[PDB]
Amino acid sequence: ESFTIPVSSLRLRDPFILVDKKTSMYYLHFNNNLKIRVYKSKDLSTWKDEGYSFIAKSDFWGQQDFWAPDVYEYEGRYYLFTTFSNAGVKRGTSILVSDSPKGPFTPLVNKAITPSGWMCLDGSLYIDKEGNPWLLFCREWLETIDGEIYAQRLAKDLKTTEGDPYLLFKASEAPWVGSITSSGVTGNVTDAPFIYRLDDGKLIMLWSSFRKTDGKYAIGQAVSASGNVLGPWVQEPETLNSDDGGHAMVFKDLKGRLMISYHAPNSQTEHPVITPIYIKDGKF
């Protein structure tokens, strides 16, 4: 196997890195225009094209978007969380499954896991201290004005949710956030919720929006000192970054080093930034 694609040459948004111990490889699934493409790497530095991990059949509910895939290993299988929409169906995140970290994925159920009555995106998976799965998602600011982030328990098989979605916070609660104007609306974006649990049980959430100071896309963090997914979430006043980058997640590499992965800048030349990250005084 040859890995000839330098990480510096990658052009993509919202990079989620799957660290797969089973095959001892890293996988980067990405939106490749109405399909999900997957690249593979031994070391995060050089990459190999492994083809398409998801191409929708004509009967798939969501024929549009294919935004921001995440892939999780869960109880021996692999689950792709990607956002879609269709004529006559609101945008939402749905879950697809494969026996392999590189796909092919098939729909777990043929509908969004996010609420059908809501425009939603960026559905992600958090596994809590007891091993139980949570869905985190955004309700789009074009609908809500002040963008919203929700949590909701998932059934053990990830096919359905339990209970009602719970509103964690609105984007305006973070002091660094500034409103943007698009599609006739001025409001605050919520993108990319992702929770990392610290050894003491406290939770950090990363998420993205635009900064009030300079209009840059950015990564913000919030802390739930209670260890409760539902909060209360306390927003940190400063963004992690000033490089117009966002949609971040964190992972431990094969050596156990904590890393962050996100794209920067936010237009024209978006590329993955994958770099070590550190926890100090309970936050990033």
Residues that bind Cl ion (CB under 5 A): 56-57, 60, 72-73
Least distance from Cl ion to the Cβ atom of residue 52, Å: 12
- From 9-17, 48-56, 154-162, 201-209, give the range in contact with Mg ion by CB under 5 A: 9-17
- From 69-77, 95-103, 108-116, 225-233, give the range in contact with Mg ion by CB under 5 A: 69-77
- From 68-76, 95-103, 160-168, 202-210, give the range in contact with Mg ion by CB under 5 A: 68-76
Q: Which of 12, 145, 198, 225 binds Mg ion (CB under 5 A)?
A: 145
Least distance from Cl ion to the Cβ atom of residue 28, Å: 13
Q: Please give the size of the binding site for Mg ion, defined by CB under 5 A.
A: 6
Least distance from Mg ion to the Cβ atom of residue 245, Å: 13
Q: List the binding residues.
A: 70, 144, 247
- Our finding on whether 16 is near Mg ion (CB under 5 A) is yes
- Our finding on whether 93 is near Mg ion (CB under 5 A) is no
Partners of 54 in the beta sheet?
36
From Cl ion, Mg ion, none, interface partner of 60 (C-beta below 5 to 8 A by class): Cl ion
Q: Which residues lie near Mg ion (CB under 5 A)?
A: 16, 68, 70, 144-146
